[PDB]
Amino acid sequence: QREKWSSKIDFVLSVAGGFVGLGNVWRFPYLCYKNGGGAFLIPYFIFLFGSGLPVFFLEIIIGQYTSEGGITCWEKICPLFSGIGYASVVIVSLLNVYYIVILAWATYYLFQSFQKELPWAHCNHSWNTPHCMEDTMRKNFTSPVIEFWERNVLSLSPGIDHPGSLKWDLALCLLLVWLVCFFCIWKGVRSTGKVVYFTATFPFAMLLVLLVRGLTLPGAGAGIKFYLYPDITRLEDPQVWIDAGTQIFFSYAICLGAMTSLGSYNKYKYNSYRDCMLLGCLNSGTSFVSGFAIFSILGFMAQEQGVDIADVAESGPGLAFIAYPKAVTMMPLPTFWSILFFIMLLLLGLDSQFVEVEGQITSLVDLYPSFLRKGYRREIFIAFVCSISYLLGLTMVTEGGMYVFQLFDYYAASGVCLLWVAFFECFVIAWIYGGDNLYDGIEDMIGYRPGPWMKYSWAVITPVLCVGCFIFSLVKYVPLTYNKTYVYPNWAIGLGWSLALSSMLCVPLVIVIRLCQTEGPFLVRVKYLLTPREPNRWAVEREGATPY
Numbered sequence: 001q002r003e004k005w006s007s008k009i010d011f012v013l014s015v016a017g018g019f020v021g022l023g024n025v026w027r028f029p030y031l032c033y034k035n036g037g038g039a040f041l042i043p044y045f046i047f048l049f050g051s052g053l054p055v056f057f058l059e060i061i062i063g064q065y066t067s068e069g070g071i072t073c074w075e076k077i078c079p080l081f082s083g084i085g086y087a088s089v090v091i092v093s094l095l096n097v098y099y100i101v102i103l104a105w106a107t108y109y110l111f112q113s114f115q116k117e118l119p120w121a122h123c124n125h126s127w128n129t130p131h132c133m134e135d136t137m138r139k140n141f142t143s144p145v146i147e148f149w150e151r152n153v154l155s156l157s158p159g160i161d162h163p164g165s166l167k168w169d170l171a172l173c174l175l176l177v178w179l180v181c182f183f184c185i186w187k188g189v190r191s192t193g194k195v196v197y198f199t200a201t202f203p204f205a206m207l208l209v210l211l212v213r214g215l216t217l218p219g220a221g222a223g224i225k226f227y228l229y230p231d232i233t234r235l236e237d238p239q240v241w242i243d244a245g246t247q248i249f250f251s252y253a254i255c256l257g258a259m260t261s262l263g264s265y266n267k268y269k270y271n272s273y274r275d276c277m278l279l280g281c282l283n284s285g286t287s288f289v290s291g292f293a294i295f296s297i298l299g300f301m302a303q304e305q306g307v308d309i310a311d312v313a314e315s316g317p318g319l320a321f322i323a324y325p326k327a328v329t330m331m332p333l334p335t336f337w338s339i340l341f342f343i344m345l346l347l348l349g350l351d352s353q354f355v356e357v358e359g360q361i362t363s364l365v366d367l368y369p370s371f372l373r374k375g376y377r378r379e380i381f382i383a384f385v386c387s388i389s390y391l392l393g394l395t396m397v398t399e400g401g402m403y404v405f406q407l408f409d410y411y412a413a414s415g416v417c418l419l420w421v422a423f424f425e426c427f428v429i430a431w432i433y434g435g436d437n438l439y440d441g442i443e444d445m446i447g448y449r450p451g452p453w454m455k456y457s458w459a460v461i462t463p464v465l466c467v468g469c470f471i472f473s474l475v476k477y478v479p480l481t482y483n484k485t486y487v488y489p490n491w492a493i494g495l496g497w498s499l500a501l502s503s504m505l506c507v508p509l510v511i512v513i514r515l516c517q518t519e520g521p522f523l524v525r526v527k528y529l530l531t532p533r534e535p536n537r538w539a540v541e542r543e544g545a546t547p548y
């Protein structure tokens, strides 16, 4: 009883809104800046064609073929490896804990954009240290934008073990954003009709304005050269490779179960290969273009301040809140452009959060529809999920919560855990289920036989990349650091590893549970649990599909 997407363009708009946003405008520039700039692009493209796009198309095709969500699809494909879907759910849950927190910051910035002069312009406020000097007079000192970010918005603490006191303004902003998300999920309100145009054209318009500004700012050539020219010796450490791979996985929202759910509503006879390739190219181009503006702004800041490009802003989640607000003040009438930019960022983040939360709730209600999907029960479950997520995200709202966010940025919904899922999604498909059988299914669905690119990416390239990155990250281990200076304690790293393992351990525990449930000799149990249970039976009669 899976609902169709009705209009073809509706699915394209929904996925485009889902898989673009803070991952392209916020996470990508900060990860590129943290990893030296140009050297980050070489793995990024390697994980872009070898994996990422093949994995995204694999998830979409699995959703369209099984006509099931993020959990039942693996039940139909390979019952033994069903826990992968569960793992995906856990991952998305962790994302909903922290991915919305960024919006709160943006909301705060929006509330700071309704005054005559932007607060991040001069060193004369009450939160400015004596070492605050205007960048025009900088010819050690700290930029007013950085001080506003890390002393007014955040009020950063000396460490994660110093939570301080909860910030009521950021807590109220997060509560308002969560209320907006809850109302959107409950009432079903979403971009419909002409609004979708403003939902689609506006985010790509304002960025273009930034592309006009950053390019024309003096000293942007140095920033562009830093962003494009790679450092060879920077590729010898696994950090850049794993960051690029996880950024590729994060931007495409794969290994979360949302893409499979979105592809489930697609019609069985629908050429989703071309659409998936076009959307992936659009997402990659958006990230690449936004990087140009970000690094041109950073180069201008480096030229005006006289410090090196690698030491102009925060090498962390707050890079987008130090660079773009700086470029806003350069444009005439900075208040209007700041309001527009933060509205665009809030819209992108809200669309991504809507898609992810709705997918998670759909997966949860589909897992056990009994006593959960009865009308008001679904509303109560949505309210409970939103309240639990807000209470969990309140830990990153305190003065010393930024460090916590970094952990959720590094281990939760990112890092080796994604490499844990992307491998197991491929190995089951490529070797257990069979690459040729899935190719026959795709030929039956889209109408033409695909090339060997997807088969060779599922069979070899993606598993090899995932296992190599995991092994090299373990062998050459470097503890997580915040802004290249702060060193997390042992317990913080243990908490981050526990957050990663909460999703990584779903796959092996479900295997043991399935083996214990089945009765008989071990070989018979494994053979029974490795047999797909009619993957296309849902659409066998709906579209006259060929049985598996």
Ligand SMILES: [Cl-]
Pocket: 023, 024, 028, 247, 248, 251, 283, 284, 287
């Ligand atoms: Cl990206």
Ligand code: NA
Pocket: 016, 017, 018, 019, 020, 021, 347, 348, 349, 351, 352
């Ligand atoms: Na979006």
